[PDB]
Structures are given as C-alpha cells and as structure tokens.
Amino acid sequence: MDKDRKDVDFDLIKMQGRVGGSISDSKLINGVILDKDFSHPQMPKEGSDGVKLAILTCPFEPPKPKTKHKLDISSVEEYQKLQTYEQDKFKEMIDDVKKAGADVVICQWGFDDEANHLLLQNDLPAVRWVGGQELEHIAISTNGRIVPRFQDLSKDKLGTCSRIYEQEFGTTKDRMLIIEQSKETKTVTCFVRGSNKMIVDEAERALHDSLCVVRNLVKDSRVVYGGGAAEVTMSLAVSEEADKQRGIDQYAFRGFAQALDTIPMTLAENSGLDPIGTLSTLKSKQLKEKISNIGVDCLGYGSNDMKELFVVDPFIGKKQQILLATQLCRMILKIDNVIISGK
Amino acid sequence: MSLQLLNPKAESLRRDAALKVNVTSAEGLQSVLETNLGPKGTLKMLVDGAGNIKLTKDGKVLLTEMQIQSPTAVLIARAAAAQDEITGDGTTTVVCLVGELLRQAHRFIQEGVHPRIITDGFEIARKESMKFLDEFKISKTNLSNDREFLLQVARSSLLTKVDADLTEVLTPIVTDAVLSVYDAQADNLDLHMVEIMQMQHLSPKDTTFIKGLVLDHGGRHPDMPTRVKNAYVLILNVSLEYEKTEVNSGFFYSSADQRDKLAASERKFVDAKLKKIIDLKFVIINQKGIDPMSLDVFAKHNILALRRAKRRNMERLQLVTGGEAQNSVEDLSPQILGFSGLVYQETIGEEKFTYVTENTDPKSCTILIKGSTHYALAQTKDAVRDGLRAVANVLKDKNIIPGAGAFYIALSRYLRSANMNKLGAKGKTKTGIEAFAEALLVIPKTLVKNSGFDPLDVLAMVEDELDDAQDSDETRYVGVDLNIGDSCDPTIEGIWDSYRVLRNAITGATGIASNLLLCDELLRAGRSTLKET
Amino acid sequence: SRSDTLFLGGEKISGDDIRNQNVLATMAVANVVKSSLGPVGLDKMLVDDIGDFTVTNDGATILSLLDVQHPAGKILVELAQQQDREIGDGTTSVV
Amino acid sequence: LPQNPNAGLFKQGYNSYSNADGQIIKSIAAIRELHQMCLTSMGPCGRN
Amino acid sequence: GTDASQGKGQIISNINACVAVQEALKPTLGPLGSDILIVTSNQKTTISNDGATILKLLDVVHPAAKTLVDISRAQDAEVGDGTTSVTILAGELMKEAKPFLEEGISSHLIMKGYRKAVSLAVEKINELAVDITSELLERCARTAMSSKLIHNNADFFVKMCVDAVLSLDRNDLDDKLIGIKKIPGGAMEESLFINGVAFKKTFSYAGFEQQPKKFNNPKILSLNVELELKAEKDNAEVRVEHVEDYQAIVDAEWQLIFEKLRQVEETGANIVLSKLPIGDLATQFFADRNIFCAGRVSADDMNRVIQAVGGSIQSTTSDIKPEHLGTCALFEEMQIGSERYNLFQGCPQAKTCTLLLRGGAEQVIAEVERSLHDAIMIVKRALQNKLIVAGGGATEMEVSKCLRDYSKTIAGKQQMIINAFAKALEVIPRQLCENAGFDAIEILNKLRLAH
Amino acid sequence: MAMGVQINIDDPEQLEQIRKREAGIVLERVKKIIDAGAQVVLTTKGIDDLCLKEFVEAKIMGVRRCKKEDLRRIARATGATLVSSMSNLEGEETFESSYLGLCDEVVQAKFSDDECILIKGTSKHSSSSIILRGANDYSLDEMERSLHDSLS
Numbered sequence A: 001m002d003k004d005r006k007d008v009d010f011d012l013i014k015m016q017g018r019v020g021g022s023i024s025d026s027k028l029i030n031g032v033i034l035d036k037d038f039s040h041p042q043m044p045k046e047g048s049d050g051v052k053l054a055i056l057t058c059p060f061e062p063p064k065p066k067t068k069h070k071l072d073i074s075s076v077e078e079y080q081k082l083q084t085y086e087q088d089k090f091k092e093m094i095d096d097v098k099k100a101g102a103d104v105v106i107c108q109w110g111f112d113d114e115a116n117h118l119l120l121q122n123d124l125p126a127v128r129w130v131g132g133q134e135l136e137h138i139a140i141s142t143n144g145r146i147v148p149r150f151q152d153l154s155k156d157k158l159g160t161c162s163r164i165y166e167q168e169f170g171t172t173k174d175r176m177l178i179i180e181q182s183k184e185t186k187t188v189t190c191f192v193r194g195s196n197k198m199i200v201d202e203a204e205r206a207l208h209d210s211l212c213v214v215r216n217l218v219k220d221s222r223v224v225y226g227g228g229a230a231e232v233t234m235s236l237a238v239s240e241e242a243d244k245q246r247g248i249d250q251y252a253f254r255g256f257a258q259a260l261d262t263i264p265m266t267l268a269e270n271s272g273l274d275p276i277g278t279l280s281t282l283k284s285k286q287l288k289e290k291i292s293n294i295g296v297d298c299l300g301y302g303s304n305d306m307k308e309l310f311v312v313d314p315f316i317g318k319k320q321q322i323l324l325a326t327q328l329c330r331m332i333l334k335i336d337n338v339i340i341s342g343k
Numbered sequence B: 001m002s003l004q005l006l007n008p009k010a011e012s013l014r015r016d017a018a019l020k021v022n023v024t025s026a027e028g029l030q031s032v033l034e035t036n037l038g039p040k041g042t043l044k045m046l047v048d049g050a051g052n053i054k055l056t057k058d059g060k061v062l063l064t065e066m067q068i069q070s071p072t073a074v075l076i077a078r079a080a081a082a083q084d085e086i087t088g089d090g091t092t093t094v095v096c097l098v099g100e101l102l103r104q105a106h107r108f109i110q111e112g113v114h115p116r117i118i119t120d121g122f123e124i125a126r127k128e129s130m131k132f133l134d135e136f137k138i139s140k141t142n143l144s145n146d147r148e149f150l151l152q153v154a155r156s157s158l159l160t161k162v163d164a165d166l167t168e169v170l171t172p173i174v175t176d177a178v179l180s181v182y183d184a185q186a187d188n189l190d191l192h193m194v195e196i197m198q199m200q201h202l203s204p205k206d207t208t209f210i211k212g213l214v215l216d217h218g219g220r221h222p223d224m225p226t227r228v229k230n231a232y233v234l235i236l237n238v239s240l241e242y243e244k245t246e247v248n249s250g251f252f253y254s255s256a257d258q259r260d261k262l263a264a265s266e267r268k269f270v271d272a273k274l275k276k277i278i279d280l281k282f283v284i285i286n287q288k289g290i291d292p293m294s295l296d297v298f299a300k301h302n303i304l305a306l307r308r309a310k311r312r313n314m315e316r317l318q319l320v321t322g323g324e325a326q327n328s329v330e331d332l333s334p335q336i337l338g339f340s341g342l343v344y345q346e347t348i349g350e351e352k353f354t355y356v357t358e359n360t361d362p363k364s365c366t367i368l369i370k371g372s373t374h375y376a377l378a379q380t381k382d383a384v385r386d387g388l389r390a391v392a393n394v395l396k397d398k399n400i401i402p403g404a405g406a407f408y409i410a411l412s413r414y415l416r417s418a419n420m421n422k423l424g425a426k427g428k429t430k431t432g433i434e435a436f437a438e439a440l441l442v443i444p445k446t447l448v449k450n451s452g453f454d455p456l457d458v459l460a461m462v463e464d465e466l467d468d469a470q471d472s473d474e475t476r477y478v479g480v481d482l483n484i485g486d487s488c489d490p491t492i493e494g495i496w497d498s499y500r501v502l503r504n505a506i507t508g509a510t511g512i513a514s515n516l517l518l519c520d521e522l523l524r525a526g527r528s529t530l531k532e533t
Numbered sequence C: 001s002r003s004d005t006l007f008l009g010g011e012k013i014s015g016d017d018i019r020n021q022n023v024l025a026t027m028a029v030a031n032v033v034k035s036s037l038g039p040v041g042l043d044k045m046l047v048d049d050i051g052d053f054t055v056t057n058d059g060a061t062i063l064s065l066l067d068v069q070h071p072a073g074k075i076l077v078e079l080a081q082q083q084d085r086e087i088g089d090g091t092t093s094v095v
Numbered sequence D: 001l002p003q004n005p006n007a008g009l010f011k012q013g014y015n016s017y018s019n020a021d022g023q024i025i026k027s028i029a030a031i032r033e034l035h036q037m038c039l040t041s042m043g044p045c046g047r048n
Numbered sequence E: 001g002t003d004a005s006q007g008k009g010q011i012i013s014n015i016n017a018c019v020a021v022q023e024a025l026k027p028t029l030g031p032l033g034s035d036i037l038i039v040t041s042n043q044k045t046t047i048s049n050d051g052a053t054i055l056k057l058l059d060v061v062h063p064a065a066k067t068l069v070d071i072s073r074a075q076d077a078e079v080g081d082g083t084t085s086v087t088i089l090a091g092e093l094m095k096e097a098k099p100f101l102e103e104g105i106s107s108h109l110i111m112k113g114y115r116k117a118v119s120l121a122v123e124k125i126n127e128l129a130v131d132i133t134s135e136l137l138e139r140c141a142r143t144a145m146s147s148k149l150i151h152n153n154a155d156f157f158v159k160m161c162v163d164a165v166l167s168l169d170r171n172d173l174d175d176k177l178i179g180i181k182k183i184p185g186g187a188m189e190e191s192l193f194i195n196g197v198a199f200k201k202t203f204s205y206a207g208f209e210q211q212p213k214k215f216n217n218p219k220i221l222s223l224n225v226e227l228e229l230k231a232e233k234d235n236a237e238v239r240v241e242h243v244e245d246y247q248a249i250v251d252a253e254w255q256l257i258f259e260k261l262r263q264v265e266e267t268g269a270n271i272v273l274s275k276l277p278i279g280d281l282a283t284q285f286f287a288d289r290n291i292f293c294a295g296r297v298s299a300d301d302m303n304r305v306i307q308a309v310g311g312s313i314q315s316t317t318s319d320i321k322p323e324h325l326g327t328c329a330l331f332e333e334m335q336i337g338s339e340r341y342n343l344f345q346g347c348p349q350a351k352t353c354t355l356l357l358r359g360g361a362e363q364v365i366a367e368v369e370r371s372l373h374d375a376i377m378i379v380k381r382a383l384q385n386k387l388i389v390a391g392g393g394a395t396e397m398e399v400s401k402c403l404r405d406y407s408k409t410i411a412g413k414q415q416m417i418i419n420a421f422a423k424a425l426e427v428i429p430r431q432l433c434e435n436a437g438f439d440a441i442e443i444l445n446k447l448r449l450a451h
Numbered sequence F: 001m002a003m004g005v006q007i008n009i010d011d012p013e014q015l016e017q018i019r020k021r022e023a024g025i026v027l028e029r030v031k032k033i034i035d036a037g038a039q040v041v042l043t044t045k046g047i048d049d050l051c052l053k054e055f056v057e058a059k060i061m062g063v064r065r066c067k068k069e070d071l072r073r074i075a076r077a078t079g080a081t082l083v084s085s086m087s088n089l090e091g092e093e094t095f096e097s098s099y100l101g102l103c104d105e106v107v108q109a110k111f112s113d114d115e116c117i118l119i120k121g122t123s124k125h126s127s128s129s130i131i132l133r134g135a136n137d138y139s140l141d142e143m144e145r146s147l148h149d150s151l152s
Ligand SMILES: Nc1ncnc2c1ncn2[C@@H]1O[C@H](COP(=O)(O)OP(=O)(O)O)[C@@H](O)[C@H]1O
Pocket: B036, B037, B038, B039, B058, B059, B089, B090, B091, B092, B093, B156, B157, B158, B159, B160, B386, B403, B404, B405, B447, B480, B481, B482, B483, B495, B497
C-alpha cells in the first residue's frame, strides 16, 4: 500500500512453510515461491538459465473433444496413422511453446505423459498441479498473463525472469521451487521453517499477528501505549466521569474501573509481580502524568513508560477490543432463559 | 386383559381430561414467549441436539425452534408461523393472546358455561372487537406522502430485543430500503430484492447499508478491471462450461485423428458467441460460470467478467442498474439493455467485495450488518427481517394505528361495552364476550408487568387500571410508556403500529381458541419404543 | 468444580502437572535409548507383537518402532528423524 | 483334517515328569535365579 | 503398552534361548542320528535329519531362537550340507562363552575377541586341505549320502548324483535345470536317471490317440504361444451389417488356425511342445503331418527340454527359424501303470538331467530326494571349489587345539574369549561320540594328544 | 488399442489383417532399438514373452521390469540415455547408437540361492554397490543401518 495511501488492506502475501529447519532458517523471497515440485525425471528441470514462464491453461493430452469421442476403426491401415497422427498434435502444441520461447510451462490438470518426452529435449521445467484458483497470485507475481487454449500461446504472456531455483539441501532433503527475479512488482512471499510442524503452524501464526498489526496501522494509523498502560487510563478518566454523573450510572460506570484493571493485573501477575503492587503505583503515575507513557513492562520488572521502552500497539488494537467485549456483554446480559430443541 | 380397544400404545385423553391436556398446554407456550413483548423485554438462548446456539427473542423463532408434544401447543406454534409469513411482526402477540384468551376459557368452566356457548361468546366479541379497530383509521394513503411517522412506526415495532436500543437508525435504513423495493413488494416481488451480508466488524451500531448492490465476486483474473468507470453492463444466464449443443450429438471420427479438427471446432464455437458480447457496447455478468478460457478472453478484450452470480443476484442485478436477464445474443439488442453505475470494488472485514458506487433504478439493495458475534448478527437479521417485513406490507396497506396498548385496550374498551350489553343479549354468552376483553387487556399487562421489568415501571395492577380509566375516553389513545412507567399518548410519541398487524394478532387468536374449545378428546398412536426415558 | 469444558474425553492439565507430565514423557523416550550411544553401548530387539523381531542400535529407527505415545514423546521422535536429514548420525544422542 | 500325537502312557489328572539331564539344566538355572539375588545381599558393602 | 526385559537379567534369556534350539538337533548327527517324525500344519508330515527342514517345519516364539533357526537355512543355501552342524555349533558357542560375560568386563570386548578367533580358526580350517580331481568325486559324494536313509544304497546314489551334476555342465551348475521326478513303487535301485525330461504328460494329442507313441530322431518345436484362434488384444467388437458375413467370419476363425500350424510344419516338425493347450482344429490340421503335439507343459519344464532337445523356444510362428528345431533321439510315453507319462531323452551335449527315483510311499521317496539333494549339492560345493577338509570332527578338534594354543599365548583381559571359541569347537565331535557311546568324554582327551 | 479408440469392423474379414498388426508395431519398435546395439536391454515396464524371443535370439540380455530409480543411476554412469518414448522429434521411430551406454561387463552373479546382474565399469567412472553378507536377515539388515548411517 506504499505510495497508495492508507486503506483497508487484504493480505495477498503468501507464507509457505517447509517442516525442515529452525525458526531463523525462514527468509523472505525476492520474488515468488511455489509449493509444487518440478516435473522431476518423469519426464527428464530447474532452472532454465535465464527464464521465461507461462501460465499455461487447459488440458494438454492428445486432442480429445469435450463431447463423446469414439475414433472407430473399420479399415486395417489407419492404425499406423492414428498412432502417428497423435504424435503430431501433441508435438506441434509443444513446438509452439518453445516457438514463442517461454522457457517453462505450468499446467493444473489433464496434462499428457507421452508429450513430456518431446518436452524433455526442450529445456522447459513443465510444472503440473498448480493451485486451480491461484492463477491470480501467480500472475501478478511473475508478470506473466494467463494462457487459455493452445492457439494463443504467444510470446506476450512470457514472464520475463532471470532464474528458477529447485533446491534440496538443508534438513530436510525436501525441496521447494524458488523464482527470482521478475520485473513486475506488488507480490511478496516468505518461506517458514521449523521442526515438528508445531513451530511452522505457529511461526506462521505469529505472523498473521505481526502482519495484521501493521494493516491496523494502514486501516487506521495511530498507536497507543501497551503494558496495560492504555487500559489504566480508563480506570482514572472514566472514574471521574462517574463522580459528576450521579444516579445509578455512577456504579455501573465505576464498573469499567473495576474492569480494565485486569489487563495490567494479569499482565503483571503473569510475571510474578504483585497485581496490587504495580496497579497501585500505576494509579499514581496515571493521575500524575495523565497515564501518558506509564505502564507495566515485564522486561523492566516494574513500572516504566510504555513509549519510553518502545512498547507500542495500534490504536485499533485496544479500541476495537472494548467495543466488542461491551456489545458482547449486552448480548449475554440480554439472556434470561435457555431452552433446548432441534433448530 | 381388555382390550377394551382401542389399541395398545394408544391413549384417549377424553372429556375434561381432554379439556385439561387441551387448555393445560396452550398457556404452556405462554411462559416461553412472555418475555418478547415490551421494549423492556429480554431474549432467549436456544440449543439443540446438534450442539448449536441460538440467542434471539423472536417468537416464530422460539416456537418453531422448539420441541413440543401437546397438540394445542404445536397448534399455537403453528399459528405463530402463520404470522411470520403473512406479516413481519405479531407472531408473539398472536400466541400471548391466543394462550391468555384460552386461559380465560378454562376459567368460564368454573362457572359451567358450555364451550360452544363460549365460542358463541368469543365469536361476537372477536368481530365486535376487530370492528373498533377498523373504526380507528388514520391511514396516510394520501399526502403528506412522506408518511415518515409510519416508517418511524415500524422502528417502534422493532423496539426491544437487541436492535431497538441502538436506534432509530434502522428505521431510516429499513424505511429507505423498503422505499426502494416498496413499489417492488406491491408487484408481488418478494423481499428477496434486499440482501443482507454478514461481514461482522465493530458494533451492531457501525453496521450500515450502502446504496448500490454489493457482491462477493470478481474479477477472477489479474489482467482485469479492478474497477469499472461509468461502463455499462449485461445481465445474462447462458451456458459457458458445458459448451454443448442441446442435442444428442456424438462426434465419431471414422478417420485417423479427425478429432484434431472437432476438438478445435467447439473450442472456437464459443468464440463466436463470445464475439457477440464483444460486439456490445463495459462489463459482463452471468449466472452460470465462465470456464478458464472464455473468461480469459474478456480479460484481454477489455471486458470485466463476473461469474457465478447466484439466481437471487442476477434478479437483484436486474433491479439495480436496470438490466434484462437475457441469454440469447443472436438478436441483441432488442429490449435488451443494462444500465450501470461505477463499479469500484472494496474489501470489508478482510473480505473481498465488489459494489457499484454509481447506478440507476434501484429497486433492490444489499445491506451489510456488522456486529460483535456471529450469534449477534443472526439475531439482527431476524430483527431487521421482522421489522423489514412489517414496513414492507404497511406500504401495501397504508392503514396505520397507534401502538403501546392503546390499540389493544381500545379494542378492550369497545369490547366490554357491547359485551356489558352482551349478558343482556343473552346472558351467559355475555361473560364469554366480556372475558374476551380480559385477554387483550392481559396482553398489555404481560407486556409491562411480567416483561417490562425495568426501568422499574412494572405493576400489573396500576398500569392496566390507568388505561381503562383513562383509555375509554382516548379512543385509540393513551397507550402506555413502559420507559417512564406512565400512561402517555403514543401518537405524540411515535408509537405507531400496522393495522394489518394488530388486526391479525386477533384474527389468528380468535380463530385459534375457537377450534380448540371444539375439542372433546384427543388420541395418539405411539411410534418410538417407550419412550418414557 | 468446573464447570469448564469439555468432558468427557476432553480434558486439560494445568501448570505443574503438565510441566511434569511433559518432562516425564520426554525422559521416557529418552531414557530408553540412553544406553545405545557410545562404543560401550549395545543394540536392542523390538518385537512385532507377532513374533517378528528386529535388532538395531540406531536411535532413530528404534524410536520409530516404539510408537511414540503422547505429544511430548512423539515430539522427540520427530526431532530424531530430523537429525538424519541434517546429518544421518547422532539421532541416538540428539534426543 | 488331522493330525495329533497320542499320549504315551496315561496317568491321573495331571502330573509333571522331568528327564534328569534336562531337569538338571533346567533346575540348575532356577537355583541360579535366587543366586544373583543372594549375591548382592551378602557382605557389608552390599544391598538389602 | 507392554514391558521389556533389559540388562543381564535379559542378556541371559537370549543365550539360554539359543542353547534351547540346538538341544533338539543333538540326535541328528551323521553317525546314528535318528530320524524325527515332525507333524506340521496344514496337514504336512515330514521325517528326517536335514536340519534346514527339521527346523523349517518347526516354529519358534523367542527372538534369539528365531535367529538360530534362521542360520539353518542361512547355511543350507550356501553349501547345503552343514544343516545339522551349524546350529549345534552356533548354540554351544554361546554356552561356553557365557560365564565370560558377567565375569568378563563387557559384551564388546568379547566381540573383538571373536574376530581374532574366526580369523585364526578359518586359517587352521585351511591347513587340513585336500584336492579334488574333478569317478573320484564319488568318494566325497558318498559322505552326503551316508547320514540319511541313503546308506543302505550309498553307492547307487553317489553315482546318480555326480552324474546329474555332470550333465550340466557349466562352470556353475544350476540345479534349476535338473528336474527330479519321484515315482512311487518299484525298487530304490530302480531309480534310473534319464538324460532328457520325464513328463506326466499323458497320450499327447488330446484330439485322438493317433500321434506317435514315440518317435526316433524327433525334430522338436517348443512354443510359448497359444496355438488357438487368437483374439484381438485391442478390445475389438464385431458388426455384422451384411447378411452372410457371419459364415465368412466363422471361416476367418478356422482359417487363422490353419495358417497357424501351416508355418509351424514348415520347420519339418514331427513333435511340438506348447506351454499352452491347442485348439481341436489346429490339433487336426497338423495331425495329418504325422507330427506329435504335447500341450500344458510347465514354464520351467519347457526350459529343461530347451537344453535337452536343443531347439530355442520361439513366439509367433511366422518368424520361425531352422535354429528353433532340435535333435533328440526318442519320445516314448510308457505307462507307469494306471497313470501315463511321456519320456523324452537323448541329444548330445545336453545340460538337463531329470533323475526319477523309486522305493516306497511318496513320503519315503521324499526323504530320499531330501537327502539326495544334500548329495547332489555337496558335490557342486566340492566341484566349484576343488579342495576338501579332514572330516569326522577332526577338522573341528584341530582348530580347537590350535586356538587353544593361541590362548596362553595371549596377553590381555580379553583372553577369556578366544578360549571360549575354542572349547566350543571341541563339542562338534563330542556328540559324534555321545551318539554312539557310552561314552563320548573319555575319547575327547585322546584326540587332544593326537592333534 | 489406444483407449477410447474402439474397434468396429466391416465388411471384412479383416479382424485378422490387423490382429497381427497390433503386435507388428510392437516388434517393429523392438527391432529398431535392437539394431543400434542391444548388448543388454533394461526396461522398467517389462518385456513380453512374444517380444523376448526376439531379444533372445540376438543373444541380448533382457531384464523384465527393473527398478526405475536404478536405470537412471546406471544410465548416468554409462553415458546412456534412459529413453522414455520411442518418438524423437517427428518423424522418428526411433533410436540412435548415441542413446546406448558404455560399460565393461554385464555379468549375472550368484549369492546363495539368489542371483543379481552386475554392471562393472562405465564411461563415467561413478558406480558403487556394496553387497553385504552375514548370518541372518536379522543382522544383514542392521549391518546396512550402520552403513546408511555411516555413509552419511
Ligand atoms: N416503544 C414502545 N413502548 C411501549 N410499548 C411498545 C412500544 N412499541 C411497541 N410496544 C408494544 O409492546 C408490545 C410488544 O412489542 P411487539 O411489536 O409485539 O414485538 P413482538 O410482537 O415481535 O414480540 C406490543 O403490544 C407493542 O405494540
């Protein structure tokens, strides 16, 4: 969204994880990555020196009709022809691929086996079974437009690139296709790594957080102070707006003082510090310095300034949380009776 | 030994016992739906055998979504639906009165008044009551066309539950929404012209409805118009995937690889049809999807292509941007046009969503309903649905009528009057008549007493009494104010209800009790072992 | 008690008990093959509960034939077969 | 279908015979079982 | 799930389980080793002394015990005579090597200590070496014959075996080209040894009995083809749009059948052996060529006749060649009484050697070949490796007194290992004496002095 | 027949005119390959009895259905080329002596009731195969474990 201004942003970023390695092994890819392996000696591979990709689409097998196909045989010579003629349609189709000069081919389904041989001596790492709905991402990435049908396969849709990589080193022997680099822009990918698969499905998770946190800044730029600091403010502010409120909404509102105190309390207690301790001392620093930077820092094992210690969270982070817990309580509080029966 | 049959596994709850099992359950469905009426009322969380959770206050919802084995009950549960269909609100009103009225029935039997004699009673009272309801009038068929108060009235209708507290914003959103599809419901075109998308975010407050249908589609190719500016559209429903003539054709190549010509033929036969569309005039929309090839042709011929537009949407798409859902383009374009408004696409709540910023002839519309929990929205849809149906039909029958109990006691006052002439004509049947009133009175008490607990205004005694003393005079006036706990005129207060609604709340009820009192016995033939379990 | 959720068949251990159950579960899969390593170490025989045997001193293959009940133990079995990918030897020791 | 080896000479209920050499190998081990358990017990620096 | 025994507490259960299996083989040794009638499943019932079959049809629960019973066949394949002995040695090898485990420092010091053993012992086992002429092999082939129920006719077999070995006939002789029919009845001395192949194949030519009983100078054609109306390999279907294309098709059938044998008789054939049966039509069209035809011959069988006759098996008769027909002297289908049997022998320089036996019941005969194999094989062992050892347990006692010598001449704590290996080899002859005692023990020290 | 390519005949009387033609095209390819060298043939799918006689008479060692993971490593050392389909460009039969390999000996050895074919010497000198030998499978297998774990 750079140079595009602030906007609600959806992640097109793709993070794929190989179970081999430790956390740190994972790295950003200056280009594209694909989960599918090469054609392997199926077949003859990576990486065509300088490369030119292709988003090949549709079937690739011997010309078969989407209607009833029955090449009946009545004579006694059309055998040779049928078998010879097939080698033609499946050859030409291949020839054109190289004709335009795109180095690589990419087909989702119904491809051909015999045709792989003709491809073998052509130096194109044909890759099959690539995500059926993805073609979108793959395109904007490798800059190569999608190619539907066989006649079109033009030199236009060729993905101007410089190298294709199919590595297998480093635990585990399992390999992944790397593509770099493409002239186009707007697509970024990262490959995760960690043992047990636990660390993958968690290092990955620990990103949809880091990432989303940033799109919180894109969706609504602003940052408060963490360490329960943001929460503490309410205990002070909201409390005053209750004294001069009178009626019954003084105790109800005082309830939001009784409430927000949890975040700092559990935050601090989860470290071993006295929930009473830091809280009390937060009340002071809160009233004294308008809770502007003060809070609880686990590292500091005390009560320093959240901002001073670079402890930052999006303004949406803690604001879109309250709005929920409240509108939620409402729902729950509206409940008076629970009965059961097949919906 | 006897047998004595009859048959085993069957039982005859007869006579008074039948009278019991009959009455004794009708009001069973009372304590269940008692909570729903009154802005001060509360909702119910329903679970099932599939481990699911529903927490909504609608009655058709708490009666259809219930398990019941006493005929009368299921019967009134049945009457609950009748409403939800023919009108948005009043299902809850239909039961509470249905039951309470039937409660007053099992009561006259303490006096020994034959049931047929009470059908006779309730019958007079029933029509005699609806009568005065007709007499109120107050319809805004004529200008001031604005009839904003009536729209305000639906909101008054939807007050309570969860949605009502927030606003006051819904009526404006529904009102406008209906007003677009207003002319639409009159035509027999259902409410399906309005679509509701759950993209939960923020609070049920932030939820809003954007002019110009929203759709969850594309744009399924990168080399495609992210947004279409001013461009015209085309609503279509032809086959793009099967790509087969509607004939029993089986291409058989007696030659060696003649398929190479046929497999290219049909692969081009689509290009021909594809070229008419290229022919006009730009974006394409079509129910049946567009296979990877054909759709990738538009993409290169500068034509944003939108596939898999659900039947609802294609009809909806016709409604907004006035288009014709025409497939055949071999004649194009006689009586075949597709107006449009800029079609910028915008994601909401992490979900892709294309909506048209600019458009014309909006006889339909989508309305997003953000929220806090999936459970919450499920209940907002019902609330919008209820109140959205009310307003809908009210625009079909302009007859208005004041809410808050006014309409009810107005019926009750007018009733007891003829009624207290009812004994005279002819005596005992009168009590039945008189009794009928007690019902419409009682629903109001339930509304505040047992349901309008707070603010602390709830007295069954005082409130009701205030209306009768202060309600005969106000003929259709003096309603209630379950907010402050006073008797205040609704009319100055925006307490406006639909005539159709508050009419049927009785028509149903009256028709229900009648056939129920006709019950002498009731029989059943077991189907499951036991099952006392 | 509780109510919490959800039983039966669904349970949870807390703090100490887990941190222990985890350590026990690890010393388990560990202490079995703690004899293997070192020249002074020996081999073992695993029975296919159908008579069939298999003599081996390899730690990786030996842990595979164990069955690895529990998350903590199987986690080590997973760490084992990682070592072969890095190297090929020392699976017996890494655990 | 068969087969089954009959019983050479019968007797009452059940009884256990033991060829002498075999028994000596077999019973000399039984003996040997309680040996390794009594070894560690004898002497001061031992075990209980 | 289950427990596990570890440490010495288990190390033992491994050893004593080993000794356990050998205990059931002590009787079997050459001298008076008595046959063991072992009833097995399904309904199998065998009887003999051949270790790798007396143990084979004997299942064992324990791991160690399962490793031993494996060495039995692990050995029989390699040489094929050390069946009974290898088990008896392997076992006793641990018994006299056990008390050096606990009293010994470790189980690994004993490992290295065993290498210096097998190395030295194999050496001493080479010192007592004899040279095979390659007639005189009949001298060694006698020994394999001697233990089992072949002694009664030790002579008759030794020849019947070195002869079968003699026919093939390659640097390496594969007994896969040496069939062994086993006819019941007659006399054990009636076990001829044809120089061709014997077949249970009844009166060939199932059409009629016309085909010759036997033919002098037969020119054979062995085929793997079907010799019957071939069906379209490519799934084809017929469409009779005509009115009488039905009769013409019916003809196309009998046609190809004739065209089939037509090009097969061109090789002047007078007898054909087809792996597959032949259609009655093609059974007649060639029958008029006075040529015999036997079908249903086994895949392996038509390979024995492939060397005997001399003709090469060929498919698709169209491309038949003169180098496919063979030269064998005769084919006479003599009846074995009630049951037929087609014999085929002769041909110069022919590898195949089918040695039909005789004697008693099918079971008696079995144990005959069972031990016959021990003979046939024992001669190849000596033929592929022309050198022999001083048997009678002498060779054993030798490496025993030799290692024993190395014992004292060793300075180390692992001395108690080499020792064990030695003491255990003395036991090899031990039973030889114990099987013919009393008594084995006194004679022991006798050999120690002599060696 | 190629699937989907049914065979319905008429009027002939030609069911035989192509029956053999089905086999002919097979042998025609078999010979086309045998005519370039054919000292030893190693397929992965396998040779047929009616197509072995042809590779047999020529005294060409043929192995029915080999390990695909092998014929690769083998061909990589003998300089040969593990051929996939017969056709090489169009139109081609085909085979070229430039496809065959370069070794010294192709002898089928023996190892106790079993025999395997070896391939000694190669154009590129990169071929190694260690054939263990011990008492029982119980050990000969574990001996390999120490191998796979030591080679690494
Ligand atoms: N704003 C209001 N204040 C007091 N009473 C109201 C108000 N709005 C509606 N009522 C009346 O209170 C009752 C309950 O609301 P209702 O429209 O019946 O919801 P539902 O029928 O779906 O349960 C009715 O008699 C109704 O008309």
